[PDB]
Structures are given as structure tokens and as C-alpha cells.
RNA sequence: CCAUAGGUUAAUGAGGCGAACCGGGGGAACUGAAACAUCUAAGUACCCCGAGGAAAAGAAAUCAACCGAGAUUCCCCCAG
RNA sequence: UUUUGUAUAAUGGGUCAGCGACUUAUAUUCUGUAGCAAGGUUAACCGAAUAGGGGAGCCGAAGGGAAACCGAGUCUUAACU
RNA sequence: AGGACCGAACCGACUAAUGUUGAAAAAUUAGCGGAUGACUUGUGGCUGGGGGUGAAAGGCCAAUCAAACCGGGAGAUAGCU
RNA sequence: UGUAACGGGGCUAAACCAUGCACCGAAGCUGCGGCAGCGACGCUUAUGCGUUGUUGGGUAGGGGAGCGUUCUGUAAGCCUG
RNA sequence: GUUUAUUAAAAACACAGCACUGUGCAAACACGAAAGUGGACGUAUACGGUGUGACGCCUGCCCGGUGCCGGAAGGUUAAU
RNA sequence: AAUUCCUUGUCGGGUAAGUUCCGACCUGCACGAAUGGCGUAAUGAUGGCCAGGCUGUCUCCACCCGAGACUCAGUGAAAUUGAACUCGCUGUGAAGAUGCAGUGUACCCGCGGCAAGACGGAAAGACCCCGUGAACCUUUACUAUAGCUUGACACUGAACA
RNA sequence: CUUUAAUGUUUGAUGUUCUAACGUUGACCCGUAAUCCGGGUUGCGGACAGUGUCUGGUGGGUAGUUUGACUGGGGCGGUCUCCUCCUAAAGAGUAACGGAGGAGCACGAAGGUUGGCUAAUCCUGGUCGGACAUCAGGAGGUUAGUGCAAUGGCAUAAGCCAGCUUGACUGCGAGCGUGACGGCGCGAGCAGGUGCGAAAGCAGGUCAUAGUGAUCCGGUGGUUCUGAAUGGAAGGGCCAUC
């Protein structure tokens, strides 16, 4: 039938204008007093999927 | 008994090589671990924290031995 | 793990807070510091813990 | 004691079979999760009851959104 | 055939003849080719019916942001700095 | 009199040999244990599979038993050959 | 198990060292004939080609081009007593 | 006496005896989804479960742990 | 010792000689009192040991009688099998060679025999390991659950302290 | 309002009595020339027993499963993440059940800045000072020290002391290093506010390298974001944090 998307991957990724996917940085959910403000400040923006993981993300998201 | 444990680092030496045209802030000598094998004196003072020596101007790396203690210095000179 | 996590709450009326560690065995007094409050954009007193 | 229970006779109907479809009562496990227990498989297989040429459902105590549509059923989108 | 490596004393087969293993459906991406060119294309269905109708819809021409929102800009942030 | 003794039919199966593509998917030959008893046997019945039955070995339940056989889920699954 | 610690015969040089020349010796190189891939120019286009340089061991695997079998159109055509 | 009918017949199992324990009858316990049935047309000298295993002499010490039996003062404690 | 590792413990008897046997000692690795302790007449196709008789069990085999095996006539399988023009030795080699190298030996083909080899045949090793394999069994593993049991409400009411 | 030997009038624990639901595997009668089952009469028990729903305990009696990997076979033992040295061949990297050791923190000062200072050890005279406590002098030169392993550092000290303080700030960040990735690390400089200095200037944590845990789920504070008819709210999102 139709391919079913990995709904967890649909929750973790959104697609950009040229193709390629934008995700949220890890290590900002939990135990944040230990981390420096430079580290958490750099983890605050969204990042791009990094070309080795693009095949896995495109496989998980056939409708993006 | 048992004694098989070890740590990890994946670079410990210079990257600028005195012909290297390093721009902006490139780490000339990262994970030197210490300010004493190399000091930074050409482009102001590098050696921020963990004593990583970095450029401050766009230019060629320069290695030199100055001072009364025969200490090795990394300088950045313009092209 | 004798040091335990505490907050530092702004005295400027905002909900902004910092977090740090403190051991109550050696320093039972409350920690007060002038820290930057980004909502007020000024340095104010931060004292209150969790 | 009255009466009911019971008994006998008569009339009418039923019974059992049949491949699939349909409605209802009950209902797994292998499997997948790269183990497994929530989950899945799946209300599937199977068992049972009942009916018809179809069955079931069906004429809003339904949606919608301040505009409106006007019973049920089936197909294509919506839309993985 | 399996292996680092088999004449191997590792596997398989007595021989012949016949049969025997990458298919099908739907969805998605890429390539080749063909039609049309900011447009392309219809599904169900209607229809003497491979025609024709039907543009419901789907994809593309616009993105940024979690979002409202803004829009060749947009988010971040007091601040295109 | 006796779950008495010896010993045939009858029931069983301790040893040895033969047979091991057997005459036989457990037998033959020479001995062997019980042989009035918790014996043996004919006919018919009853107990049905996480069940029965078991003087108990996981024995037996149609040459099948740490879960019978048949049909179905079923083309289970097989990172293995 | 049988010479069995030059491959054997056998060698007093047919052993070892030094120098020299010659020859044998491969699917290596060259000669002659032929096929194919890739690249660079020339005559200019679903361009036929030529010149020239070079390449062509292959498992897993990737790419390219094809042979043959059954069936359908072409096919009431063609072959065929 | 019985036993792995088809590699083990034994010291294994059973046994008469012995003890513990349950059971007052619509008994305990068992089969059963329930009716019902066995126990039993029996009635504590009876029935079940367990362990030991004729007979003779005997069976000592330990209740801390785990079971079982008895008690409810206190603590904890469900649905409501 | 159905129990003892050391261990063939040590002592005694039996024997010419006894790791087994029988009687003791206690130094019980690691017996022990209904998981029963110790003994026990009779019983046992029960385990170990000794002796008399008896013998081909043996020294050490010999002969004979039958059924096969052997020949002839009739009928007529089987496992197995890549193909075979299917020797020995020494070495080499996926490391134990009929097949490779060197060498020696050997006319071609049956029949009766023996099994040293063909890592002979049979059974996709049962021992060992592996698989995020299976089954069954155990428990004080985890999660459930039948049963047993506790209470509330309902079936379920009326008086009196 | 806390209480009264008749009155306006409830709730909950046992205890006694009754019968009238319920039980009867007591007796008798009928259906019926039936050990069943009903109905009737009566006796006994009696709101108990028993059953339904909910619920705490117990529950290998059953049922589904789990019970790691490396490993000079497996099991036993040991190990699994992070840091330092050597192996490691003078760039980086580099294995073994190779050789040695540490970490799962600490510090509101042991951070920042300004000002100042310089050790270990040895030889001598003096109060229990003795070989080593504290002075004074000389030699020496970092043989010390670093909050904690090891290595590389460190005198312009990053080692020791004092004053003032919170830059152990917020948003960003050209440019790099290192990873397959998740990520991790270094960073001049810009803006807003600070601190220490007369000033140049320095400070976005500690001499550096260990001191750690993704995601999901959920909690707390904030928020001109969303909020399934509208206004809210619940819930979700974003930021900080657990």
C-alpha cells in the first residue's frame, strides 16, 4: 500500500528549502546545572542533519 | 590482577607549520595541554583555556625561539 | 555528592533564576550574589534557593 | 375445597442439508517489537447461533461553525 | 560450495529425461525516454464506451519560525548587529 | 490352612549364544522366575491430551509420548545451512 | 614402513670463491596478423569515418550490449503434403 | 509381589506395620465454569493427605530461619 | 562403610603371592537416630568373596557329526556410487596421498579367503560451543492468574439494650 | 453552645429476640404403581449461610517469559563508562584477559581583579625544640608547591598572602580542532550590563587534561505562542530547571 512514515521521525525532523532536515539539538532536556552556558546556548538553536544520517532520515520520512 | 585501562585523545600536536596561511582564529597548536611548549606572542596573546594556541590575524604561522629561557613561540605574520 | 543543587532567584520581581551547587554542612547561610537579570537588563541581587 | 400443576385429543408451524456472502455470541497463538510482559498479530484463524437473496444499517437527542448541510450504504480523495 | 587457504582424506551429486528458486500488487525516490512548459495531471464515476467528459483532488511555482505571525525574506535577540 | 514348597498348561523375561540388509521394526534355542493368587484370561464398557492412567519408569495412551494423532492458523519464524 | 637431510643418476669438478664472455629460459618485451574499450584532433551532424596515443587478470559487486525459448500484433501475409 | 511393553528387574516402587495431620457429614478432599458425582448408601475402631517401611532394641538436643497452629494490645493497611 | 579424598590407611586372617573379601582400630575429607539408627531368622534370576565337586574356560588345541560357505542347474536382491586407464616408498601439500614430485616395482583377467587402508558404508555428531533457538521441569526470578481467604455494597427485613 | 429518667430527630460497631426473604443433601402428601425435579403441609436454621460486583492478602496450583557480552573453547575469576603515561614506529591515530595508576568529586572561595611575595634541602648558637616545632645567619636555586592519579607545564609565576568584589554575567559569534553520527572542545570580536585597577587592561569559572547519562515520560517557575462553535480554561508549545 502507501508507505507509512516513522511518526517519531516526523516528530523529530522538519524539512528545509533546499532539501535536508532540521532537528533540535540534544542535551537540553535534563541535568542542566552541570553544563556551561556556552554549551546550552550553542545547543539552543536548531541544527541540520549531517549527510551520513540523511539517508536514514529520508528513508524514515517518505512524505516530507 | 588487572591493569588494562586507558584514556583517549584524538589530536595532541600543532596544525600550523610556519608556511601555513592560517586565517581568523585557527588553532595553531591545540591540545598542547599547556602554555610552555608553545607560547603565543605574534598576533597578541593566544592561549585561551586548555592553552590552545590560536591565530588572531590572517597570516602565516611563525615558529621562533625567544627569551632568556629558550622558549618556543608561535607568531602570526601577515602575508 | 554532598553538594546539592540550589536556585538563585532574582530580587527584581521576575521569574528568572540561576542554578548552582552548595553544601549546607559547611555553608548553611544563604548565598547572595549580584547577577545579571536579562528580563530587567540590569545586575540585581539573587538570593533565594529551592 | 376454588383454582392452578398435570393428562389426553385436534389444528398449524418447525426439525435436517447446502460453497460463498451477512448479523450476533465466544475467541487464540505462532509472529513483529531484531529478547519480552504494555502493544502487535487481531477481533484474524477457529467454534457456535440465526437469516436472506442479499444481510446489516437507516430517516439526526447527526455534523458543522454563527455560514450552512439535511436517512442509511458503497467508491475516489482528504491522508499515511 | 564454503573458506585465510581444498586434489584434498571438508560438503553435495549413481546417471539420464522432465520440473525447480529475485515474482506480483500498491506507494515512494532516482535514472533513461516521451508529452506538455509555470504549469502538469486526473481518481471514482458518467459514457454507443481504450474516445470524450469529470480538475474532486495531487504535485510544483516561497520560504522562515515551535507557533501566532511575517513574507524574498524570516527566525534568534533589546538589537540585519 | 497358607499372597506355603517342587513342577506342566498359563503368565513372565534373569543369563548366554545366534540373528542385527533378521524367519521376526525385540524373535529363536538352551537354561530361568511365578504357577490358589496383590494370579491369569475371554467378551463388553468407562477414563481424552497441560488431559487420562500410572505397586512411579516421565512409564503407557494404536510399532508415535518431558505432552498422542489428524486437520487448520500456515507459505509460523529461521541474524542459520 | 624403504635408499629418504643433492629431486634422481651421478659428480673430485658436474663443489666453493673471484673475473669474463656466450647460450638457454616466461603468457614479460619485440615482430606479424586480427578484435574491442577510453581519450585527443580533422573533415561538422539520429555524421559514416580517418589519424594518433593508450588500455583490455579478475572474486563480491556496479555499469554497458546482446543470443535463444513460449505467447500477442504484423497474420485470411509468407513457408508448407 | 511391581517396574522403564523394544539395552536397566535392582538396593528402585509397593507392602503389612508405625506416626503426624486434616475431617462432625450437605465431612475433608477430588472431578466439574454449574448442576451433580465420587468419597459412601461409609460416619472418627471412618475417610483423606504425608512421611517411614515386617520384627527386636530404640528414636537424643535445637522453634534462631522457613512453614503451620493459636492471640489481638499496638503499628501499617484496600475497596468504601 | 552402597558413605573415607589421602588410600592399596594400619593390624589380623585367608593365598606362594589378595588394590577385592572377612574381623578390627578410629585419624567419621564429608555416618547418625521415621530424610529413620543398629541388629535381624527366613526369603532373593540381588552385589562382593571363599571352598568341594565338575569340567575344552584355559595350557593347547585335536578329531568327528550335521546346516551354510565351494561347484553345478533354476530364480534372483541390497547398502553404496563425481568420473576412473583404481601400486609401494620418501617428501610435499587444507598440515596422515592410488592420483602431486622424485624413485622403485609391476604381463592381461578371474576364483576362494583376510580385513591394514580407501580419514570405508549408515545416521545434516547426541559430547563442546554458538543462535538475543525450542520444549519441559524447578524456585525465595518477574508479571499475571484458577483456587483459598478478607472486607464494602446488593439479594437483606422487624424490635430491644 | 458539652450534657437532660416522654417529645423536633440521624449515623456506625458488636450482643439478644422474632419471621417474613433465603437455605434445608429433615418428615409427610400430590404430580406419579419416579433414588430426579417441582408444588403443598410442617419442623429446623435465619437475615446468618450462600451468590453477584468491587477490593487487600495468599497463591509454581497453573501460564507467559527473562536469566548480557568480551573471553587465546566454554564455565570460574576478572572486565564493561571517563582521565594520565608507555606500548605507539620524532604529525594525528593505533590492538591484546599488555605494563602501571586514578575518576563518578571539591571550591561562593580554592572564582575575578589589583597590589605584594618566593620555595625543597643542608650547616650552626637558644624554653620540655629532641634528629625534625619557633628565631637569626650562610649555602642552594625550584631538587619545592599545585585541592586530588599521572603527564606536559608554570618566575611575567598558573605556586603563597592581602584588599575590593561576583565575568561561576545575558544574547551572539567570524573562524577552527575533533568525531561515522549523536555530539564534544577552543575561540578573537559585537551588543547590553558589571567587577577590579590611576591607567594600559583583565575577567563568559578554577594550571590544563577525569568528576559522567541520550531519548521518552513526568514535575516546578516564567511566557504579547497555540488553545479543535465563541470567551476563557484544561492540555500542548517555547525558555529556564528537576
| DSSP tag of A64 | -
What's the CA gap between C28 and C6, in Å, rounded? 12
CA atoms within 13 Å, Cβ hemisphere of B51: 14
Contact yes or no for C10/C28 (Cβ under 8 A): no
Contact yes or no for B57/B78 (Cβ under 8 A): yes
Resolution at which this structure was determined, Å: 3.0
| DSSP tag of A35 | S
What's the CA gap between A27 and A37, in Å, rounded? 12
Contact yes or no for C8/C14 (Cβ under 8 A): no
**HEC-encoded secondary structure of chain B:** CCCCCCCCCCCCCECCCCCCEECCCCEEECCCCCCCCCEECCCCCCCCCCCCEECCCCEEEEEEEECCCCEEEEEEECC
B50 strand J contact, CB < 7 Å: yes
E strand or H helix at C34, and its extent?
strand C33-37
Contact yes or no for B17/B51 (Cβ under 8 A): no
Residues 6+ apart with CB under 8 A from B38: B14, B28, B29, B32, B53, B72, B73, B74
A26 strand E contact, CB < 7 Å: no
Minimal-distance CA residue of chain A relative to C5: A33
Residues 6+ apart with CB under 8 A from C32: C45, C46, C47
Nearest residue to C37 (alpha-carbon basis) of C19, C18, C50: C18
E strand or H helix at A42, and its extent?
helix A37-43
Cell of C29: 547561610
Residues 6+ apart with CB under 8 A from A16: A22, A48
Mutate to test the interface with C, among A33, A34, A35 (most CBs of C within 10 A): A33
What's the CA gap between C49 and B4, in Å, rounded? 44
Contact yes or no for B5/B38 (Cβ under 8 A): no
Q: Could you tell me if A33 lies within 8 Å of chain C, comparing CB atoms?
A: yes
Q: What strands, in cross-sheet order, belong to the sheet with A46-48?
A: A14-15, A21-24, A46-48
- Would you give the end-to-end CA distance of chain B in angstroms? 58
Chain mean position to CA C25: 18
Cell of A59: 528513508
A63 strand E contact, CB < 7 Å: yes
Burial class (CB in 10 A: 0-12, 13-18, 19+), C48: middle
Burial class (CB in 10 A: 0-12, 13-18, 19+), B63: middle
Nearest residue to B33 (alpha-carbon basis) of B13, B54, B51, B7: B51
Cell of C25: 554542612
Amino acid at each position: 500500500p502507501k508507505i507509512k512514515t516513522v511518526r517519531g521521525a516526523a516528530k523529530r525532523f522538519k524539512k528545509t528549502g533546499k532539501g535536508g532536515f532540521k532537528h533540535k539539538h540534544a542535551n537540553l532536556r535534563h541535568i542542566l546545572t552541570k553544563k556551561a552556558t556556552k554549551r546550552k546556548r550553542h545547543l539552543r538553536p536548531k541544527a541540520m542533519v549531517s549527510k551520513g544520517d540523511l539517508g536514514l532520515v529520508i528513508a524514515c520520512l517518505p512524505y516530507a | 590482577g588487572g591493569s588494562t585501562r586507558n584514556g583517549r585523545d584524538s589530536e595532541a600536536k600543532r596544525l600550523g607549520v610556519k608556511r601555513f596561511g592560517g586565517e581568523s582564529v585557527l588553532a595553531g597548536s591545540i591540545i598542547v595541554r599547556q602554555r610552555g611548549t608553545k607560547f603565543h606572542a605574534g598576533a597578541n596573546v593566544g592561549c585561551g583555556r586548555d592553552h590552545t594556541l590560536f591565530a588572531k590575524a590572517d597570516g602565516k604561522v611563525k615558529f621562533e625561539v625567544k627569551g632568556p629561557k629558550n622558549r618556543k613561540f608561535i607568531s602570526i605574520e601577515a602575508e | 555528592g554532598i553538594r546539592e543543587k540550589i536556585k538563585l532567584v532574582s530580587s527584581a520581581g521576575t521569574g528568572h533564576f540561576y542554578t548552582t551547587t552548595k553544601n549546607k554542612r559547611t555553608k548553611p547561610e544563604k548565598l547572595e550574589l549580584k547577577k545579571f537579570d536579562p528580563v530587567v537588563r540590569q545586575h540585581v541581587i539573587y538570593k533565594e534557593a529551592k
